[PDB]
Structure formats: C-alpha cells, structure tokens
Amino acid sequence: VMKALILAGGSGERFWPLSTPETPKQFLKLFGNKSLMRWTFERVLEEMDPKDVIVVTHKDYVERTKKELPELPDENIIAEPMKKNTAPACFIGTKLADDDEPVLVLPADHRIPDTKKFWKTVKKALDALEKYDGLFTFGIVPTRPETGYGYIEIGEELEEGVHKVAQFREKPDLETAKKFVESGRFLWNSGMFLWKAREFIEEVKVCEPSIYENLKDVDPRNFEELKKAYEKVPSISVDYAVMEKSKKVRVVKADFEWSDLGNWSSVREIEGYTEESDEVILVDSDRVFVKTHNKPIAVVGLSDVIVIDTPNGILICKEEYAQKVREVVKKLF
Amino acid sequence: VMKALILAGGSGERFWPLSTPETPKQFLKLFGNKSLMRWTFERVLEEMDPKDVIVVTHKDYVERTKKELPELPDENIIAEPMKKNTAPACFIGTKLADDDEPVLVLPADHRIPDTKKFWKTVKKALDALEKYDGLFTFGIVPTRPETGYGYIEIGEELEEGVHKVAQFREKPDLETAKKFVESGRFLWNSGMFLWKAREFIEEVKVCEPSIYENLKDVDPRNFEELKKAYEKVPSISVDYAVMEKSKKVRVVKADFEWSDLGNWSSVREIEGYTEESDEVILVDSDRVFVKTHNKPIAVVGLSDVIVIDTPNGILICKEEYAQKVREVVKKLF
Ligand SMILES: Nc1nc2c(ncn2[C@@H]2O[C@H](COP(=O)(O)OP(=O)(O)OP(=O)(O)O)[C@@H](O)[C@H]2O)c(=O)[nH]1
Ligand SMILES: Nc1nc2c(ncn2[C@@H]2O[C@H](COP(=O)(O)OP(=O)(O)OP(=O)(O)O)[C@@H](O)[C@H]2O)c(=O)[nH]1
Ligand SMILES: [Mg+2]
Ligand SMILES: [Mg+2]
C-alpha cells in the first residue's frame, strides 16, 4: 500500500509570540481558515485513506491532534516522551508500516497551493524508489536566493528529474545563497522524504546507531518504553543524522510553488510587506512586516523589520535575524 | 517684584504614545512621582509666592492644570485658543507684568535636580539684568556634543560668566557639534529666559510685529479677543521669532545639571540603555531603550532603537530619528 507520516512533534519556537509551547505553530490558522496541520492532512487525504496516515507528535499535543484531524484514527497518533528533532521522529513512524511499504515523510508546516502538482511529484518519487531504491528527498526549484533554506546539489542523473545527491548543503550566508541559485543545479531542501521502511531503518543503524540500537526493539505505542529509550537517543535532525552521511540519497525535482513556515520571513514573502494604514504608521521606514492587535504600531527610521504584537508579547526583529527567534523562546521559557 | 512665566501649552507630540492630545507630556511623570509641570512649579515655589507665577496653557488643559497646581490662583492660568508655539505665549504672559518687572520664562519640561544651584544662578542673572539690561538666556555647559540642541556663541564678555550673545546657532552635525564643544566658547540653549517686561515687548515690536500689533492691546484673559488675535498671529517659537534676530541678547552660564525632555532619547539619556530582564529579551541587540506594558518585549538584531509600549500604541524608533515622532502624531491624529 502506501503510508503517510505527518511530523507534528516540534515546538515552533521561531514563531513566538504567536506560537507558544501551549499553542505551537502547527495549530495556528496562518493561512486560509485552517491550521497548518489540517492543510497537510487534507492534501494527503486527496489520494489516501485516513487509515494510511500516521502522525508523530509530542504527548502534549495528542488531544489537540484528535480535534484538528477527526477523521484520523486514535491509534494513528503517536505520542513521544521528548522531542529530539526529525531524525528519531522518522524512526518510530517507519516501524509501523510494512517492511517493503513506501512511507512518505511530511512536515506539517509546508504550504503547497497546487495539490495535484504535488501528487504528480509524489507519484514520480514512488516509481523512482521502486526503480533505484535509496532515500528520496524532494528538492524545490528555487525562485529566489532565500537564506534559511538547506540546499541539495545534483549528482549524476539517473532518469529525467531524478538525480543522486551530489552534495547536501545547509545555512547559506546571503552571498552563499546567491552562489547556490546561479549554478542552475542547487535545489532547496524541502524537508519531505520518501523511503521504504526497511531500507531507512537499515541506513539509520549504519549512519546513526545512537538512534537505531535504542529504538530497534521498542514498540512505538508503548509510551513508557519510548520514554525510557528516548532518554538515550540523540537530538539531531534527519538531514544531519542521515541524509548527509548516507551514500544512497537521491533528489527528485519538485517543480511547484512551495514554502516552509520556518521563520517570520516566510509569512512576509507570502502576503508581502505590510502597507501603511490607520493601524500601521510608517515614517522613513521601508519593507516592514507588521502584525497588529487592536492598537496601532508606528515604525520610524527602520527598514526590513518584522513587528508582531500579541497578548504573549511583542517581537521586534530585523529580517536577516529571524532565525534567531529561538533564543527569545529559550530565554523566555 | 519678579514674575515667573511657565510655558505649558504645547502638545508633547514627540512623546507618542505616552503623550496624547488628551494627556500631553507636561502631565506625565517621566521622572519621580510628579509630572513635568508639578516639578517645574515646586522648583519655582521655593523662593516665590504663587501669586507671582503665571502658567500659559492651551484652553483644554486649564482644568487639568488646576488639579496639578491647587496653590496657583485660577486667574494666574492664562488660557490659549490654539498653539502658536512659545513666542506668542511669551508675549501674552509678559504683558501681564509691569514694564520694569523682570519676568523669568520657564519651560515646563526640564529636569533640574539642584534647585538651590538653579536659584543661585537666577539671582546672578537678576543682578546682570539691572547692570546691563537686554534679554537674558541661560546657557548650559555642554557635557557631550548634542545633535538636538541650539547653541549660544559667546560674544563680548560683560562680566565673568556673562556675555553678549555673539550668535544663536542650531542643530549641529556630530562633526559641527564636536567643533562647538571642543572650542569651549559655545553653551547649550536651555530655552530659559529672563527679561524686564517693557523691554521684551519692545523687541517683539522690532522682531515680530506680526505678533506685536495683534496682541498689543489684547487682554490675555479675554478669551474671544485673544481668539481673534491668535487667528492673525504666526506660529513660531520665541527662539526663531525674537532671540535670533535681536541685538541685545545676553547669556548666563548654567553649570547645574540640566536636561530637556524633548524626545524619547532624553528619557534614555536619564534612565540609561535598558538591560535584559524578565520582560525585555535582547538577542544581538545593543544600546536599546524599551518601555514595557506588562507583557514581554523581545528585540532581535537591532541596535540603537527605542521601543515604547502603551494602551495607546506601540512606537519602534531608530534613535537618530526620535524627532520624527511628530509625524506619527500628525498621521494618526
Ligand atoms: N516527532 C517530532 N517532530 C518534530 C520534531 N522537531 C520538529 N518536528 C516536526 O517536523 C516539522 C519540522 O518543523 P520545523 O520547521 O523545524 O519547526 P519546529 O521544529 O516545530 O519549530 P522550530 O524548529 O523550533 O522553529 C514540523 O511539522 C514539526 O512539528 C521532533 O523533535 N519530534
Ligand atoms: N502656552 C504655550 N506653551 C507652549 C506652546 N508650545 C510649546 N509650549 C511649551 O513650552 C515648552 C516647549 O517645550 P517643547 O519641547 O516645544 O514641547 P512641546 O512643544 O509641548 O512638544 P513637541 O510638540 O514635541 O515640540 C513646553 O513646556 C511646552 O508645553 C504653545 O503654543 N503655547
Ligand atoms: Mg526545528
Ligand atoms: Mg514644540
């Protein structure tokens, strides 16, 4: 068959003060009248049954999860004891499928307007997997040189639009992101993945036993076991843990509009710089993304800043620095 | 006998959002648990009887002034129809004195902690007033090269510390201010004045007839005459109007600590730059001023900015632009 793994187990620290530990980004209606998570399940449901859809989560957001995705079975929600980033998150999820069953790993913080373009891309990814095995990533074609994107360099072509990962890069300085685009053959690391359960779990033991050995004989739905094991599991991402080191990483071309709700800069790029109005007063200040809350905000003498007013607090952030909003959360919480 | 003329009819537009047209800066408690106006009044009352003190205001602030200043007779509050800046309020205030009455003109928004030393200086001015006549001012020894002040180029010395004003200057470049302070022959222009009532009026007649003729026979307390009188009178400070033009401005040295509460930087200059606490979260942000309102403020990647949060609005201001807060009030109101 096929199984979709929805990763909804992070904090969404970079979206303070809208996102909190009590209410992470996954449940916010940033776009449309639907949450980030809801949009992801709907896109998935287009072609798949709910029975086939699995959500790896922190124990706290279980009840939240049941609300947003009522059609999801109670059993298909997995509750983690601790968050240790996307690497372990993938391991517990992949064990639930059949050994040879293809598992589509999806972040819940992606905005992909064209769901059919999406599914064509997942179909092609499905056939590539059958044809070459390995671990697939979905590389978005850059439309700009955005910092705060991981990148994928293209290796030897296998078939049209499917290549080996020549080089897996991260964290571009402003010029280093201009370098990337120029080339013609650097794609944005989407954060989506496709693999067959068995091959993936096999590469984890090779690449990251720290992960494997403590989770190989652990049942995912045993909370008290998962707890006991996660105490020895490292907090590393899928990418640093596996997708860099592994010698069978492939990349498929995702030729569609795609955005990652990573940091506040991403929301700006969607709806654009805020224009002056009764509630947002501007004086010698260009390229501002303000978000108001029943009282006006004036920015004077500042350009390329994010301003977000909330009952949780106010963020005032230079756009370049948007990735550091973690620090705020870390200190505050 | 000597009279005091307190200018408290302005809007405090550069203190938005703390200062509003309903509650301007003169009624705010920027330092200590008293308002600017109250401090100004208590300073005066040390050596002076309330009957000898006059406060010039806008009409809307009349009831509020009474509450702040219960010792001041109702009749010693002169009510204005509309703002014409200080030069007009200086005229209708001074007219109330006798011709040979030395009037001491005081902004309601200075911080001068050492009242003993202030008064010492006004006595030295008073004696200078008898020997030399002319208009006096009070020039503060510049402690740093301020961009925000006008300076008093010392002319001929009449007597130690007391000089003919050679010239009145304005907002220097960091460079040009650096020249004035390095030379030792330039004092900051406090905005304080001392003059005999007849002589001042005589100067307005010579430097600003516009004002003179329209208010020469007006009764200041007659609201409607004044109203018709102000319809015909230019909005202009006493500095541009009279002091810059006239040929008998003298200046006395103020060695005391003095500060003008002219914009938000002035507050920072007193309180100092704000440090991290439970409510001010700083992340790669230096030299910052933050006024919280019972919810956390995080500043990320911005140096030299003012952030003020209130029920009325939020200001985010690059320091060097602090003067432009007027333009916020203009748009918003
Ligand atoms: N199960 C699990 N999921 C995670 C973990 N970390 C992130 N995720 C999920 O994987 C996706 C990638 O999330 P990110 O873009 O990194 O956002 P985030 O991790 O929630 O929040 P920050 O990275 O702190 O800003 C999101 O849908 C998360 O919910 C984790 O440690 N465990
Ligand atoms: N009576 C009267 N007083 C004034 C007028 N304009 C300013 N003042 C006062 O004289 C002093 C001058 O201080 P300013 O720095 O100009 O303060 P402000 O004009 O109230 O506030 P800004 O609009 O920011 O300039 C303050 O005490 C003012 O209240 C006026 O038109 N009439
Ligand atoms: Mg993360
Ligand atoms: Mg003014």
TrEMBL record, chains A, B:
<dbReference type="Pfam" id="PF00483">
    <property type="entry name" value="NTP_transferase"/>
</dbReference>
<dbReference type="Pfam" id="PF22640">
    <property type="entry name" value="ManC_GMP_beta-helix"/>
</dbReference>
<feature type="binding site">
    <location>
        <position position="260"/>
    </location>
    <ligand>
        <name>Mg(2+)</name>
    </ligand>
</feature>
<feature type="domain" description="Nucleotidyl transferase">
    <location>
        <begin position="3"/>
        <end position="271"/>
    </location>
</feature>
<keyword id="KW-0342">GTP-binding</keyword>
<protein>
    <recommendedName>
        <fullName>mannose-1-phosphate guanylyltransferase</fullName>
        <ecNumber>2.7.7.13</ecNumber>
    </recommendedName>
</protein>
<dbReference type="GO" id="GO:0005525">
    <property type="term" value="F:GTP binding"/>
</dbReference>
<keyword id="KW-0479">Metal-binding</keyword>
<feature type="binding site">
    <location>
        <position position="12"/>
    </location>
    <ligand>
        <name>GTP</name>
    </ligand>
</feature>
<feature type="binding site">
    <location>
        <position position="84"/>
    </location>
    <ligand>
        <name>GTP</name>
    </ligand>
</feature>
<comment type="similarity">
    <text>Belongs to the mannose-6-phosphate isomerase type 2 family.</text>
</comment>
<dbReference type="InterPro" id="IPR054566">
    <property type="entry name" value="ManC/GMP-like_b-helix"/>
</dbReference>
<dbReference type="InterPro" id="IPR049577">
    <property type="entry name" value="GMPP_N"/>
</dbReference>
<feature type="binding site">
    <location>
        <position position="326"/>
    </location>
    <ligand>
        <name>GTP</name>
    </ligand>
</feature>
<dbReference type="GO" id="GO:0004475">
    <property type="term" value="F:mannose-1-phosphate guanylyltransferase (GTP) activity"/>
</dbReference>
<dbReference type="InterPro" id="IPR051161">
    <property type="entry name" value="Mannose-6P_isomerase_type2"/>
</dbReference>
<feature type="binding site">
    <location>
        <position position="9"/>
    </location>
    <ligand>
        <name>GTP</name>
    </ligand>
</feature>
<feature type="binding site">
    <location>
        <position position="80"/>
    </location>
    <ligand>
        <name>GTP</name>
    </ligand>
</feature>
<feature type="binding site">
    <location>
        <position position="109"/>
    </location>
    <ligand>
        <name>Mg(2+)</name>
    </ligand>
</feature>
<dbReference type="InterPro" id="IPR005835">
    <property type="entry name" value="NTP_transferase_dom"/>
</dbReference>
<feature type="domain" description="MannoseP isomerase/GMP-like beta-helix">
    <location>
        <begin position="278"/>
        <end position="332"/>
    </location>
</feature>
<feature type="binding site">
    <location>
        <position position="14"/>
    </location>
    <ligand>
        <name>GTP</name>
    </ligand>
</feature>
<keyword id="KW-0547">Nucleotide-binding</keyword>
<dbReference type="GO" id="GO:0009298">
    <property type="term" value="P:GDP-mannose biosynthetic process"/>
</dbReference>
<feature type="binding site">
    <location>
        <position position="85"/>
    </location>
    <ligand>
        <name>GTP</name>
    </ligand>
</feature>
<feature type="binding site">
    <location>
        <position position="56"/>
    </location>
    <ligand>
        <name>GTP</name>
    </ligand>
</feature>
<feature type="binding site">
    <location>
        <position position="108"/>
    </location>
    <ligand>
        <name>GTP</name>
    </ligand>
</feature>
<dbReference type="InterPro" id="IPR029044">
    <property type="entry name" value="Nucleotide-diphossugar_trans"/>
</dbReference>
<feature type="binding site">
    <location>
        <position position="10"/>
    </location>
    <ligand>
        <name>GTP</name>
    </ligand>
</feature>
<dbReference type="GO" id="GO:0046872">
    <property type="term" value="F:metal ion binding"/>
</dbReference>
<feature type="binding site">
    <location>
        <position position="13"/>
    </location>
    <ligand>
        <name>GTP</name>
    </ligand>
</feature>
<feature type="binding site">
    <location>
        <position position="25"/>
    </location>
    <ligand>
        <name>GTP</name>
    </ligand>
</feature>
<feature type="binding site">
    <location>
        <position position="7"/>
    </location>
    <ligand>
        <name>GTP</name>
    </ligand>
</feature>
<keyword id="KW-0548">Nucleotidyltransferase</keyword>
<keyword id="KW-0808">Transferase</keyword>
